[PDB]
């Protein structure tokens, strides 16, 4: 019974994922691996190609509406911020499409998103990343890791750790059906500070985790220790976000000309 019930639950979360996220890992890898297609991403690897891309690629956030221009490294950071906020919106709609998340009182929904979205973002980031760079502009561009490394501190430093995580995470070869459960588990997390109904979120979390371990025995029958490995990645993501927040505190302190989106301010407010 348990195995069957959890299979149904996993399908419902997968559908939530497919309904709400702009890009799947399946579509991202097909673009990254240069699979047969009539278009390839424009490669952004330096100042000239960045400029060409702001001229020639289609961006969800129009450039005129980014904060006023400061310099190349900051401009890149503003593009990072734009896409981060866009992903928070997707994650919010994904979570809302899970009935046991929507049943929670709205204040607990906010607390879970507040403390979970960055972990979920850096996990789902891996889907559009390879060792050489990442997709941007809905897959119409590819920004090289080497170019991101070339930006001045503090902006290069806040980027490279996410590549290090992503390449290791991609070696586990999760697909979108795995990620739907993994991200649902990240968000529905009973450990978040200030939660009102902890036992309820703990129970949901546990249900998602049992669903996940069964999902992996079916979908990845030959992959030994894959479930405990993913529990460790959940732990790892907390540390990655702790780091990230500390780096953001330093950008707020030392980069006073750099504009920080007010939603992200509300997220770091307490951390
Ligand atoms: C949401 C993900 C995570 N990112 C950002 C990102 C990726 C990898 C490492 C770090 C990143 O952002 C750290 C700062 C985040 C500040 C917002 C905040 O306070 O969280 C991106 O999708 C992204 C988007 C656009 C570009 C780009 C465009 C033109 S040239 C480069 C590069 C990356
Ligand atoms: C869209 C989901 C993402 C939500 C982002 C984080 C929300 O921040 C928090 O919102 C609360 C009001 O609801 C305040 O009481 C907190 O002080 C503030 O930190």
The pairs formed by 226-233 with CB atoms below 8 angstroms and a separation of 24 or more are 226/172, 229/172, 230/172, 230/182, 233/123, 233/169, 233/172, 233/182
Q: What kind and span of H or E run contains 210?
A: helix 198-219
In this structure, how many other beta carbons lie within 10 angstroms of the beta carbon of residue 19? 10
Q: For residue 140, is it left (φ>0), alpha (ψ between -120 and 50) or beta? A: alpha
- Say yes or no: CB of residue 113 within 6 Å of ligand 2: yes
Q: Is 114 in the pocket of ligand 2 (CB under 6 A)?
A: yes
Place of tokens 């989106």: 261
CA of 80 to the centre of ligand 1 (A): 3
Read off the DSSP letter of residue 65.
G
Per DSSP (E only), the strands in 27-162 are 42-44, 129-130, 133-136, 141-144
What gap in Å lies between CA 31 and CA 41, rounded to an integer?
A: 8
CATH number for 1-271 (one of 2.30.30.140, 3.90.1150.60, 3.40.190.10, 1.10.565.10): it is: 1.10.565.10
Cα 258 to Cα 71: distance, rounded to the nearest angstrom: 10
Which candidate, 159, 134, 152, places its Cα nearest to that of 43? Answer: 134
Residue 172 tokens, joined: 């586990």
Distance CA 75, CA 63 (A): 10
The DSSP bridge partners found for residue 129 are 134
Distance (Å, whole) CA 151 – CA 71: 10
Strand, coil or helix: 258: coil
The 42-44 sheet, strands edge to edge: 42-44, 141-144, 133-136, 129-130
DSSP state of 180: H
Ramachandran area for residue 263 (φ above 0: left; ψ -120 to 50: alpha; else beta) = alpha
* Domain segments of the chain as ranges: 1-271
Q: Which of 87, 110, 120 to mutate to test the pocket of ligand 2 (most atoms within 8 A of CB)?
A: 110
Separation between Cα atoms, residue 32 and residue 11, nearest integer Å: 27
Indicate which ligand has the atom closest to the C-alpha of 258.
1
Contact 75, 90 (CB under 8 A): no
Q: How far does residue 69's CA lie from ligand 1's centre (Å)?
A: 17
If one counts every other C-beta atom within 10 angstroms of the C-beta of residue 268, the result is 15
Resolution of the structure in the document, Å: 1.7
Instruction: Write out the DSSP string of 92-108.
Output: HHHHHTSHHHHTS-HHH
């Amino acid at each position: 019974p348990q195995v069957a019930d959890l299979k149904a639950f996993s399908k419902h979360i997968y559908n939530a994922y497919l309904k709400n996220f702009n890009m799947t890992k399946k579509k991202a890898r097909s673009i990254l691996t240069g699979k047969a297609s009539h278009t390839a991403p424009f490669v952004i690897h330096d100042i000239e190609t960045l400029w060409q891309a702001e001229k020639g690629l289609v961006w969800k956030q129009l450039v005129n509406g980014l904060p006023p221009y400061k310099e190349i490294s900051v401009h890149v950071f503003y593009r990072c911020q734009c896409t981060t906020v866009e992903t928070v919106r997707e994650l919010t709609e994904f979570a809302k499409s899970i009935p046991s998340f929507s049943s929670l009182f709205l204040n607990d929904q906010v607390t879970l998103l507040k403390y979970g979205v960055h972990e979920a973002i850096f996990a789902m980031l891996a889907s559009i990343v390879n060792k050489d760079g990442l997709l941007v502009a809905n897959g119409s561009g590819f920004v090289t890791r080497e170019f991101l490394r070339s930006l001045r501190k503090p902006f290069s430093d806040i980027i490279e750790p996410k590549f290090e995580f992503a390449v290791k995470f991609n070696a586990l070869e999760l697909d979108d059906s795995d990620l739907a459960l993994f991200i649902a588990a990240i968000i529905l997390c009973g450990d978040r500070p200030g939660l009102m109904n902890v036992p309820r979120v703990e129970a949901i979390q546990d249900t998602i985790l049992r669903a996940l371990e069964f999902h992996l025995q079916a979908n990845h029958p030959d992959a030994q220790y894959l479930f405990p490995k993913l529990l460790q990645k959940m732990a790892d993501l907390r540390q990655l976000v702790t780091e990230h927040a500390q780096m953001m505190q330093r950008i707020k302190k030392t980069e006073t000309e750099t504009s920080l989106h007010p939603l992200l301010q509300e997220i770091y407010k307490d951390m």
